[model samples]
Target: LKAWHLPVAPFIKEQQERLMITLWLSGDDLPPRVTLRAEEDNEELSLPMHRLRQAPHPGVVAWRGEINLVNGQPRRRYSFKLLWADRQLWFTPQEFNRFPPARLEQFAVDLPDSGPQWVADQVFYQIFPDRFARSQSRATYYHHAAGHDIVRKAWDEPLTAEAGGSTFYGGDLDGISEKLPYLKQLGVTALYLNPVFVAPSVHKYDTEDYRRVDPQFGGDAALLRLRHNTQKEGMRLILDGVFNHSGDSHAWFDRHQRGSGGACHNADSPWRDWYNFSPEGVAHDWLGYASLPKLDYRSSTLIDEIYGGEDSVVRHWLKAPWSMDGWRLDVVHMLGEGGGARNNLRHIAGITQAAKLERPDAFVFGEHFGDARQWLQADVEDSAMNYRGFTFPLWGFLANTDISYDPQKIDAQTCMAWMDNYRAGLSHQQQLRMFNQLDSHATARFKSLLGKDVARLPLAVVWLFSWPGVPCIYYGDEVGVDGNNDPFCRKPFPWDPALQDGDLLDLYKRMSKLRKAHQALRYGGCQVIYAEDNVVVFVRVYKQQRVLVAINRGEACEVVIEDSPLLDVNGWQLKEGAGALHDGVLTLPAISASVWFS
Candidate 1:
């Protein structure tokens, strides 16, 4: 039997104190009766379900149930109980079990705050500040490099791992401001920028000061101009925040003898408690790197300076002239006390609460490398980078490699399963607000991942725009920028039209517009129609509107689907690719992707 439940639309609703939930079970196997099992005030409430007279598909049956909630209590945990003459079983969203599901594993309903309302309608673009676009001359700045001298390089020069930190391309805030028209033409609605704060290195993950913009990037005035221009262009801007650690050159750390009352300089320094230092007077740094000293959240003064106070760094940028849309918290999972992640959730929640207090609609998300389920709960974060949920699984399925650049190809079935597992506990709105991307500054470019085959990029592009989450394009991916990892991936944008990939660029533009042109693609109900070895078919539905997407990564083949009311072929329109459906059979080209509307 094929069974599913959508958390939104006609499936669930709340009217005052009463709540309604509905489920559908399809195929030949039918139970005699069904009821909803809910937990309320440490007691079990088994309510009967009423069968509907109509069905959604040819062999489907619908059941509706009602639950009464106490005053001010809307969130609840529930599951389905199906009883047959021979046996009885329980069903959660993940699987069917003989016993009751765990409290956290049960399907959640009416959870607090389902992400920002504006995120569902946006297509994001990520830009690395040092290499994106340049509008000024090369300017040198102070640095603490031991072997190399800090200098600006030609825009077309290749990057070396040894000099990645010492060399710069002089890309600045004015450069980003000048490209507003180009981004508007590409249909990008939001921009997520890498660190633009004051730091010694080109990549500003190690921050020297939290309140000032790097003068090499045209100073604080340039940022204000960029902010004004972005607002006028109707775009959202979010800045990268490095709160887990600060650079050793920071006034508090003062490793370069810049300040007299610094932690490393004076043993009796007042800021000594800001960092975790051993009894032998050695500071604890992130990954043991002496340049990036880890912060100690155990001290209340450090908390006040970073986020607890009204004039803290978290609230400063979101105020007055700056008024950033949000903050992309960096290395948030590693924040805690004494060189370990102890009481991490408490600090994350505090930072989120402080940000929201300043800007009620602000979008606060964390940058986590592994599982971020605990951080995404109510009142913690709106969303995350979605690596464990979106990027990793897609890379495994399409690129045939993992984040470590090791071969770990998976079938289409396993790909969908992994995605579902990551998306299980999140609400429907949370699903649509996720940030999805093909590549970033940290990994090898997607073009290089596909072995420099520009033809296959369309397959991933179409998938990126059609998927539930917000699609984000890395700086140069649309123009066929190829590189290996890190320092190489962060290349300057090719401003010359002759050096770009026109055809691939056109595809990105069209897909971006297509994503905004459809209501079903933005916020809709999702269902998997078919999944095989290298081919998968899925549909997104909103009211009477339906859009279907199909991809084939192997060889050209004919896919057959049994005739049913759900698969009705009337009034269907082909949007992309050469795939065609006639008489319950779809003819798909080899290594292709297609989209259909009904």
Candidate 2:
């Protein structure tokens, strides 16, 4: 059944006191009519649904309706449910104040401001700070054996989980600073850097210091310089913020009174409250890991220090020269829930809302492994890493080869069922704001997982660049890099001239150029023309401009696109790959993809 317990912003119309509700459901037969009951309205109101053919979902539909009540505005705090003929979806049980509904929101009068509106227009190029590039200079302190544990690897060496754990390659901000022009030429409008925070670990998710940039990658000075460097090039920067918990050895937790810092030792240590410390011997850990003591949002100090204070870590960097454009919040869901205080909504919205208040243009999105429509539609956060929404279905559809995660293969119809349904929950602008990626630090490189068949990869790349969300290309993804998960995927950049994948590079550049050339690809609404086994066709529409994209998975096929806005056959010029269009039918070769702008 199509349903969501939603946030107010995606639905409410202030002037009219009306609400537009949306439901994304699967299967062929959509119900004829649905009615919703609000606490204040004794009468069940009937609402119509549209079986959206434009959506590519194989056997799915989007049903939307308006809630305009004479009894009063739809109750924001409600025990609500939909009443359809012999069937119903309940967001809030008849009287249970349960886990937040997947369907409703904290209704506000106006549309929530999408953190930074410009983020939608960007093509994000993500770079891991320690692996991107090494500076020309012989470097700063190269070995970490001085402190906890470490090894320095030469650029060309292959990495394994064992030897790769404590290693650093000396890639720094200066190296990335030098490559700004190179990245710019590649059409990267923004840089989403993995955490540069001072931490002992390579990945930096375990933050030792909230305020300091890792001197290994670059100190505070280097970060500020890189921040300005991007601004000089008129590009944006989104740094990682790991606020769910800090490194166990972080200043507050080092209770040995080590280095003038303290923790659990002093029952009075204000920092002790930040973490969940049971009077019993064991402390509450994040997923049973002793190292990460779950943070308790009940502590005003913790929330204040991280997000709500005048000089809080979250708000500070978004100011001055190192004005970070946005943040990719790490461990977002664990913030205030099972950790201790159950103020998840308040905490999530507080952090997001506070960041925006501090920097009116700040973009804040979180990292979650599952459904995030609850946070997104609530308008608490601008966006999230779109894996369930964009990744799984896309991979299931096109990534046919066996590799890591052994992802299942599905036809275009089955695949789009997931994609369209997920997309259906979003507002038009929210679609544009999402951070959609093909691969990232946590997953296998897209190329590696696709069985190294270079032909199939470009088709996926074309779809990514043409998708509604802000498409992000993981660092080194363009140069044919391959790896599977964590330390393996975290390989240093292959700066050597012969090491690059020229064909892939050329393909990426061309697709990027096309996306940048046409506003329709970025801002336009998307509609599916044909979706089935081995063939997918869709269009991007913005005002008078319409661009069509048709992809052939692995076999040569004649793809017929119907009701295409394209009136002139000549207007359908092949922009990339092996395809020809006559009228609305496109003949594409096996393992091919084509983008036509008319």
Candidate 3:
């Protein structure tokens, strides 16, 4: 049976404090009765459903049921139980099963105010500001807290780990501002930049002051200029918020010998409680890195300095000339009091509440490597980096390696199952706001991960754009940049046309345009039609519009999807690559991808 439900209206609704749920079914044989099955307050309940007078679409049936929202219940789960004479079945968003599934595996629903309504419609582009472009000569600045060195290099130079964090290439805010036209042409609607705060490192994760932008990368004025440019272009900007730790050179933690009062320098300092220190006066750092001190959120003063206060770092950039649209919190889950993250959830909620109060529509997400289920609840975070769901499984299936470059390959069936399992735990609204990507500054380039083979790159790009969530393009990935991990993956953007890969760039442009042109691709209900050893096919449906995507990773073969009345509509047109549908079989080339719209 073709069954589904979403968290939006016509599928789910709020009636006073109760919930009005609707489940849509499309099939030839109609069941005699249907009921909404759920567990509430540690008790099981089954409520009868009433059929609607008219179906929303042709050849479709709808059922409506009401469920009470308990006094303290903010999250709930439910599934559809369809009954025929002697047989009964359970229908979930993932699939139809004979026995009932666990509550966590069923359709999830949270309270209203999911997130900023604009996120699902825009395509984001992540810029590593230090390597994207350089507008002028590299400026030199002296750190007052500590003597940090800076080494300037040309635009086209090899990056080495030995250079570490001191190497600078003069890529400033003005450089990113000047390339707005190029980004606009590529159909990028938003930009997420790496850390840009005042720090000695090229990456800028070790922040010295939250109020100042790095002088070497054009100061506070440069950010205002970039803001002005983005506003004029009608694009969104997301700044990186590195609140987990502070540089040892910061005023709060002065490791070097100085007359000024700091937590490490003077025990009598006012902010001495801002950091966790041993009995002998040694400060505790993040993962034993003495240069970066872990903040102790147990102090009220630290809370006020970070986000609790009215005019704090969380509210600073969200106001005035440099109005940032959102914040990508760094190491969000690992932030808490001394020694461990005990009150982590409390601190995250406080930060999110403060951010929302400043700008109600501001999008706040986190930088997490693994599961983000706890953080994605309503009023906490809009979403997180979707590495565990989108990138890891997709990369494992295609490149046959994990995020650590380990050998952990899987076939198409397992890949689809893993993706479905992850999405089953999130609400539909949160699913749309997930940060989907192939590679970023933290990992190796997808091109390099695939062994520099151009054939598989298009397949990955097609999957990236067609999947649920917001798609993000890493800085140099569009131009065929190849590198290994960390400092190597962080390569300078090739500005010269001769050095760029025109074909790969064109492929990215086409995919971006396709995503923008099709509403079904952006906000659609996904249904897997076929899955096999090296091929997977799915259909995306939004109202009357539908899109079909097919991807192949092995030798060329024909994919046969059984004929269904749901996919028998007319107006089918080829939207990308080579694809022909004769009867119910789709002909696709090896290591290629194709898309169709109806």
Against the hidden true structure, what lDDT does model 2 obtain?
0.71
Q: What is the TM-score of each candidate against the true structure?
A: 0.94, 0.81, 0.92
lDDT (0-100) at residue 518 of candidate 2?
A: 89
Candidate 2 lDDT over 451-549, as tens digits, reads 746568888889889988888989998888888888789888886759988888788888889888888788776666678888888777664566778
- On lDDT, the stronger of 1 and 3 is 3
Q: After superposition, how far is residue 354 of candidate 1 from its true place, in Å?
A: 0.6
Note the Cα lDDT for every prediction shown: 0.81, 0.71, 0.82
| Range of the 10 consecutive residues with the lowest summed lDDT in candidate 3 | 137-146
- Candidate 1 lDDT over residue span 1-598, tens digit each: 5556656655667777667878778667778798888767546689899898988666778888877876333446678898889888777756577887766556655544434778888889899988988875435656774345687789887677767777789888899998888998988999999998888888888788998999878889989999999899889989998888899989898988886888976888888998988888889988988889999999899999889999899999998989998888888899888777778888888888888889988888888668887787554787888888878887878888777878877998898888776777665667788888888888899888877344567888888888778888899888878888888898889989998998888888988777777787898766667778888887776656777888888789999965544454456698887788777688999888988887
Question: Model 2, which residues run further than 4 Å from truth?
Answer: 1-114, 138-148, 255-257, 337-341, 400-407, 452-454, 564-570
In model 2, pairs of residues that clash are: 4-102, 4-103, 5-102, 5-103, 5-104, 6-103, 6-104, 6-105, 7-105
